[PDB]
C-alpha cells in the first residue's frame, strides 16, 4: 500500500474521531455560554482539554505521513492543516513559556484596570469602563486620560511580555520553515500546486499595499472631512493640516470611526433610518427576527434553518438567574447541529446581526458535506465577509420596505444616502488604514525590521504616516500601544479585517450584478434573487476544499482580492467628500502633535 492511500485512511479515521470529539467540545462550550455554572466551565474545559489533546496526538501521527509523496491535493491540504497545528515544533519549555506569556497578556488585557486621578477608589476596566469613555465622551481631557491611562498602566505591562512573545513566535515560525511569525500568519492565504490559482505568502503584502494605495484617496478625503468636523468641535485641539489625535476617534484605538458620526454627520437634520420602533409597533419578538432572516436566505434559494436550529439555539436572553454570554455567535458544532447564540433585542441592530450571523450558518451548512478539516471559510476573511453582505442587503430601505418595517411613504433622498454612506465609511473605510498599518507594524516587527528600541517610535511614525493619526502624549519604548488592542495581545491576526472588508464588497457587487440590481451598489438588496444565492452558494459549498482564489472566482469572476467594488460602494460619498473638502486641506502632516 502506498503512502497516500495510508493518509487517506488516516484522514478517514481522523474525521470520524474528530467530529465526535469536536461536537463534545462544542456542545460543552455551548452549554457554558448559555448556562454559566462552575460545573459548565469544568465540563467545557474537560471536553476542550480532550479536544486539543486529541489534535496534538493526531497532529503528531499526521506528521508521520510526509507531504511530498501525496498527489491528491485534497488529502495534502487536509494533512497540511493537521501537521501544521502541532506546536511540538517548539520545546515544551518554550511552548510552556509562550503559553504563560499568552495567558498573562490575555489576562492583563481582560482584567487590566485604571483608577481615576484624585480618587484612587473608583477604577475602570476597558469593558465597559474605558470603552464607554472612548465611545461616548466628548470631553477631550477625559478621553485623553482613558487613552493614555490604558496604554501606560496596561500597555507598559504588556511590553516585556510582547518582546518575548515575538521571540518565541518567531522561533516557532522559523522551525515551521516560515520567515517569521508574520510570514506564518500570511500562510492562511497561501495556495500551492494549483496552476493559475496559486498565491504566495509575500503576495499578500503586495496585494494589501497595492489595494490600499487605491483606498488612500477615499480615506484622505474622509480623514480630511472628519478632521474638519472635529476641528469645528475642537478648535483648540486639532490642526487643520495635522493628524487626528488618537483619543478623539470614537474608540480606544481609532480602529473604527463609528462613534464620530454625531460630530461628523453630514446632515444632522436627517433622522437616520431606524426600524426599531416599527418592530416594536408590530410586536416583533426575537423568533420573528430570525424567521424573517430565515425567509431572506430562502428567497435566494438557500435552505431554511434546520429543526435543530430552532429547538437548540438561544435567540433570547434567558435572563433572571441563568447567566449567558451575550456575544452574537453562529455555532457549527458539526453533526448537522447549527445554532445561533444571541441575546436578541427587538432592534434594527440585532435584526441586521441575525442576518449576519445566519449568513455564517448558511456558510456552515453549505460546506458541511466537506471533510472536517475543510469545514471553514475559504480563508480567514471569507466567513465574516459572508456575514457582512447579509446586513448590507437587510439594512437597505428596499429590503426594509418590502418586509413592512419601513413605510412606503418613506422616500430616500440623496442626503440620507450620504448620511448612511458616511456612517459606513467611518466603520468600514476608517478601519482599513488602521488595520493595514497595525498588521504592517507586526509584520515588520516579526521580520526584525523594527528594533525593540524603535517599536513605539516606528508604531507612531506609521500611525501618523499611514492612518493620519497622532498620539496625544509622547510614548517611549516602555509603552506597547499595539498590545493595548485585543487582537495584538491575544495573538490574533489582523489583516483578516482588511481582506474581509474588500471581500464583502466584491461579494455584494457580484451578487447585485447577479441580482440585476439597477442603481448605486449601496442600495442593493439580493433578496428574491436565486441567481445571487446560487452564485454565492457555489463558493459557500467549497469551504476550504478549494483555493480561496478560486472560491473568490466562483462569486466575483476574479481570482484576486480587488478594491474596486469597495470604492464603487462609497463612490457617492467619495464624490461628496471631494466637493466638501474643496476649501479644506486633504492629507495630513506627521510633524504636528497636540503636545506643542
Amino acid at each position: 500500500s502506498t503512502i497516500e492511500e495510508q493518509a487517506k485512511t488516516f484522514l478517514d479515521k481522523f474525521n470520524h474521531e474528530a467530529e465526535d470529539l469536536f461536537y463534545q467540545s462544542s456542545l460543552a462550550s455551548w452549554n457554558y455560554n448559555t448556562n454559566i455554572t462552575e460545573e459548565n466551565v469544568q465540563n467545557m474545559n474537560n471536553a476542550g482539554d480532550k479536544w486539543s489533546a486529541f489534535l496534538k496526538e493526531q497532529s503528531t501521527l499526521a506528521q508521520m505521513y510526509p507531504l511530498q509523496e501525496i498527489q491528491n491535493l485534497t488529502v495534502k491540504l487536509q494533512l497540511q492543516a493537521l501537521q501544521q497545528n502541532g506546536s511540538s515544533v517548539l520545546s515544551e519549555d518554550k511552548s510552556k513559556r509562550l503559553n504563560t506569556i499568552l495567558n498573562t497578556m490575555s489576562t492583563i488585557y481582560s482584567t487590566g484596570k485604571v483608577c481615576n486621578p484624585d480618587n484612587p477608589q473608583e477604577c475602570l476596566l476597558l469593558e465597559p469602563g474605558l470603552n464607554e469613555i472612548m465611545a461616548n465622551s466628548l470631553d477631550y481631557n477625559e478621553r485623553l486620560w482613558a487613552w493614555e491611562s490604558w496604554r501606560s498602566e496596561v500597555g507598559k505591562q504588556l511590553r516585556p511580555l510582547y518582546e518575548e512573545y515575538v521571540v518565541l513566535k518567531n522561533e516557532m515560525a522559523r522551525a515551521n520553515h516560515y520567515e517569521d511569525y508574520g510570514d506564518y500568519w500570511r500562510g492562511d492565504y497561501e495556495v500551492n500546486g494549483v496552476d493559475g490559482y496559486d498565491y504566495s505568502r509575500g503576495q499578500l503584502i503586495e496585494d494589501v499595499e497595492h489595494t490600499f494605495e487605491e483606498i488612500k484617496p477615499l480615506y484622505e478625503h474622509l480623514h480630511a472631512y472628519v478632521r474638519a468636523k472635529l476641528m469645528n468641535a475642537y478648535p483648540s485641539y486639532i490642526s487643520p493640516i495635522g493628524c487626528l489625535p488618537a483619543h478623539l476617534l470614537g474608540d480606544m484605538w481609532g480602529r473604527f470611526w463609528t462613534n464620530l458620526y454625531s460630530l461628523t454627520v453630514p446632515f444632522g437634520q436627517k433622522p437616520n433610518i431606524d426600524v426599531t420602533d416599527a418592530m416594536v409597533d408590530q410586536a416583533w419578538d426575537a423568533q420573528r427576527i430570525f424567521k424573517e432572516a430565515e425567509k431572506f436566505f430562502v428567497s435566494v434559494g438557500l435552505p431554511n434553518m434546520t429543526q435543530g436550529f430552532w429547538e437548540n439555539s438561544m435567540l433570547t436572553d434567558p435572563g433572571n438567574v441563568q447567566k449567558a454570554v451575550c456575544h452574537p455567535t453562529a455555532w457549527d458544532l458539526g453533526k448537522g447541529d447549527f445554532r445561533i447564540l444571541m441575546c436578541t433585542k427587538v432592534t434594527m441592530d440585532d435584526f441586521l446581526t441575525a442576518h449576519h450571523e445566519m449568513g455564517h450558518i448558511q456558510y456552515d451548512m453549505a460546506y458541511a458535506a466537506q471533510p472536517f478539516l475543510l469545514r471553514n471559510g475559504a480563508n480567514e476573511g471569507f466567513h465574516e465577509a459572508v456575514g457582512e453582505i447579509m446586513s448590507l442587503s437587510a439594512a437597505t430601505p428596499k429590503h426594509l420596505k418590502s418586509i413592512g418595517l419601513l413605510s412606503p411613504d418613506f422616500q430616500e433622498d440623496n442626503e440620507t444616502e450620504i448620511n448612511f454612506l458616511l456612517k459606513q465609511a467611518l466603520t468600514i473605510v476608517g478601519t482599513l488604514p488602521f488595520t493595514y498599518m497595525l498588521e504592517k507594524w507586526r509584520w515588520m516587527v516579526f521580520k526584525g525590521e523594527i528594533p525593540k528600541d524603535q517599536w513605539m517610535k516606528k508604531w507612531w511614525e506609521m500611525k501618523r504616516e499611514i492612518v493620519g493619526v497622532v498620539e496625544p502624549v509622547p510614548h517611549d519604548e516602555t509603552y506597547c500601544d499595539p498590545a493595548s488592542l485585543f487582537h495584538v495581545s491575544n495573538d490574533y491576526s489582523f489583516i483578516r479585517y482588511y481582506t474581509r472588508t474588500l471581500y464583502q464588497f466584491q461579494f455584494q457587487e457580484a451578487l447585485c450584478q447577479a441580482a440585476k440590481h439597477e442603481g448605486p451598489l449601496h442600495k442593493c438588496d439580493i433578496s428574491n434573487s436565486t441567481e445571487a444565492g446560487q452564485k454565492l452558494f457555489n463558493m459557500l459549498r467549497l469551504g476550504k476544499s478549494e483555493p480561496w482564489t478560486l472560491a473568490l472566482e466562483n462569486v466575483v469572476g476574479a481570482k484576486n482580492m480587488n478594491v474596486r467594488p469597495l470604492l464603487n460602494y462609497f463612490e457617492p460619498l467619495f464624490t461628496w467628500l471631494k466637493d466638501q473638502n474643496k476649501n479644506s486641506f486633504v492629507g495630513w502632516s506627521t510633524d504636528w502633535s497636540p503636545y506643542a
Binding site: 500500500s1 495510508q6 485512511t9 474521531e17 456542545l27
Partner: protein, 195 residues
C-alpha cells in the same frame, strides 16, 4: 391465521449495529404488511422489484428482515448499486435486490444527551462486502505495510467507529432504524402469503 413476527423486528427495543446487522428469517406465517405501517413517518418505504401498493397477496418462499441502525445521510446507501461506508463495509444489497427498505427516525430512542455509543459501523475493510455479507470481525485494520499485532497505533486502526448519537444532531446525523425485507423465490412451497 398464523401471524408473522414483524413486531419483534420493527418494534424492537434495541436494533443491531449496522456492521453486526441483525437478520430474522420469517417463514410459515401470514405476513400482514399493512401492520408494518407504524405510520410514524417512515423516511424510506421504497421497495425494489415488487410494488408496495397492496401487493401483499403475493407469496414468497422466505422473508428475511435485516434490521440495523445508521445515520440519516447513510439511508441512501440501503439500495442496489450504492456505495459508501455502509454499503461497502457494513450492509450491501445486490444489484437485482427484490425487497423493501424501511427506515425511520429513532432520535427519541437511539440518541442520548451524553452520546449513545451503542451503535457502531465499519469504517475500514480490506474489500467491499458481497451482497448480504456480514463482517463482525474486530481485527485491527492494517493501513500501513507493518504488522499491526492486534492493537491500535500508527496505520493500525480499529475497524469500527461509533455514531455517538445525540438528540441535538442534525437530521443527516440522527439515528435511523432500518429494516430490509428480502423476498426469496425458490422452486419451493412458498410458505409466506398473508392474504
Amino acid at each position: 391465521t398464523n401471524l408473522c413476527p414483524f413486531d419483534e423486528v420493527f418494534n424492537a427495543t434495541r436494533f443491531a449495529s449496522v456492521y453486526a446487522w441483525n437478520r430474522k428469517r420469517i417463514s410459515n406465517c401470514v405476513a400482514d404488511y399493512s401492520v408494518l405501517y407504524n405510520f410514524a413517518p417512515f423516511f424510506a418505504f421504497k421497495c425494489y422489484g415488487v410494488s408496495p401498493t397492496k401487493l401483499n397477496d403475493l407469496c414468497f418462499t422466505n422473508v428475511y428482515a435485516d434490521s440495523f441502525v445508521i445515520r440519516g445521510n447513510e439511508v441512501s446507501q440501503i439500495a442496489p448499486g450504492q456505495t459508501g461506508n455502509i454499503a461497502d463495509y457494513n450492509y450491501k444489497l445486490p444489484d437485482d435486490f427484490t425487497g423493501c427498505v424501511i427506515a425511520w427516525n429513532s432520535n427519541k430512542l437511539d440518541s442520548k444527551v451524553g452520546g449513545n455509543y451503542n451503535y457502531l459501523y465499519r469504517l475500514f475493510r480490506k474489500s467491499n462486502l458481497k451482497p448480504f455479507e456480514r463482517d463482525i470481525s474486530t481485527e485491527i485494520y492494517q493501513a500501513g505495510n507493518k504488522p499491526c499485532n492486534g492493537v491500535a497505533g500508527f496505520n493500525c486502526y480499529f475497524p469500527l467507529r461509533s455514531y455517538g448519537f445525540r438528540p441535538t444532531y442534525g437530521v443527516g446525523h440522527q439515528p435511523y432504524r432500518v429494516v430490509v425485507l428480502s423476498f426469496e423465490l425458490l422452486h419451493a412451497p412458498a410458505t409466506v402469503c398473508g392474504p
